[PDB]
Structure formats: C-alpha cells, structure tokens
C-alpha cells in the first residue's frame, strides 16, 4: 500500500489481502477487518474473487447465513484459506449453538445434527456434554430454561434532576 508508483503491483497482492481479511475474520476483529477492507479499491472489493470471498463471508456471518458460511469451506477460492477458515467454522459452531440455546423452546437430535452441521452422533454427544444439555430424554434437547424495580438507580436519576434544577 505504501509504495504506490515505483512498483508494478504483484498479482498475488489481492489473494494475500483476502487471506489477511480471512485471518481478521477468524480472530474476530471485525473493526480492523472493515478498516483494512476499506483500503481495497472499489472494483477490487466488488469483482475480484479474492476480496469478494472474505467480504461475502462476513456478510453471511452477520446475516446468520451459516449454511453459506459452511459452503465457503467448499468454495475456498485459494486452498491456503483452509487454515483461517477451520477456526472460523468452530467459532461459528459455537455461535449457532448459542442461537439454538436462546431459540428453539425444544429441539430434537436427528435434525439438530444437520442444524449444527455435525456428521456423527458421537460428536453430537461430546458437544452436548460441552456446555451441557439434557441429552434428549424423549430425543428432544429441552433446554427451555427461559420485577425488581431499579429503585436505587431511579432515585439516583431523580436526585440528579433535583440537583440540576437547584444549581440554578
């Protein structure tokens, strides 16, 4: 980026910049990800595959399109992207599990396998042991575990009103 002119640019530049964007996404530094992404020229962000795949992957992650995020594992425009993508998949497994925790008053197992994108009941059982589930007594993971006036804070606010009125 520094030595514009006096240099002819390297064809590997866009690929390696996209790899850096993948690294930033994997480490979950979204602000720095977007900041560096802004460095890429417009048409480079919009057309070049190496810069489109990282940005599209962030778009899918923000939307929740975990299916397409997983399909990125097959997309992989450059094979070197696998390393920074595997850790992102594991973090996304955690994020999907959090979504499942909050939603899904009740969920089964045979379909929860596809939902979590796992391929083995042993992996399913290990992951359930991770964090902790009810194992599906009726084959259903029933993780349905869902006053107190802030009187102190409200009194502080009202006293602030009084003080701001009386310092006249």
């Amino acid at each position: 980026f520094d030595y514009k002119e006096q240099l002819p640019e390297s064809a590997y530049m866009h690929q390696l910049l996209g790899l850096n964007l993948l690294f930033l996404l994997s480490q979950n530094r979204v602000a720095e990800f977007h900041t560096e992404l802004e460095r890429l020229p417009a048409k480079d962000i919009q057309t070049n595959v190496y810069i489109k795949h990282p940005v599209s992957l962030e778009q899918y992650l923000m939307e929740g399109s975990y299916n397409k995020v997983f399909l990125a594992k097959g997309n992989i425009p450059a094979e070197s992207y696998t390393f920074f993508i595997d850790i992102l998949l594991d973090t996304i497994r955690d994020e999907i599990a959090g979504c499942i925790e909050k939603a899904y008053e009740k969920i089964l197992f045979t379909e929860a396998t596809r939902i979590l994108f796992f391929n083995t009941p042993k992996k399913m059982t290990d992951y359930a042991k991770k964090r902790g589930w009810v194992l599906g007594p009726n084959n259903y993971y029933s993780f349905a575990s869902q006053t107190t006036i802030p009187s102190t804070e409200l009194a502080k606010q009202v006293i602030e009103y009084a003080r701001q009125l009386e310092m006249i």
Binding site: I149, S151, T152, L154, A155, V158, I159, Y161, A162, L165
Partner: peptide, 17 residues
C-alpha cells in the same frame, strides 16, 4: 408541578427500598 413530581418519585423509591 416539577417539585411535587420529583419529590414524590424520590419518596416512592426510597420507600420501596
């Protein structure tokens, strides 16, 4: 009115606690 309302709000909160 502001005096009355602020005072009653503070009294209610102090009482609730």
């Amino acid at each position: 009115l502001m005096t009355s309302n602020i005072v009653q709000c503070l009294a209610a909160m102090l009482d609730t606690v």
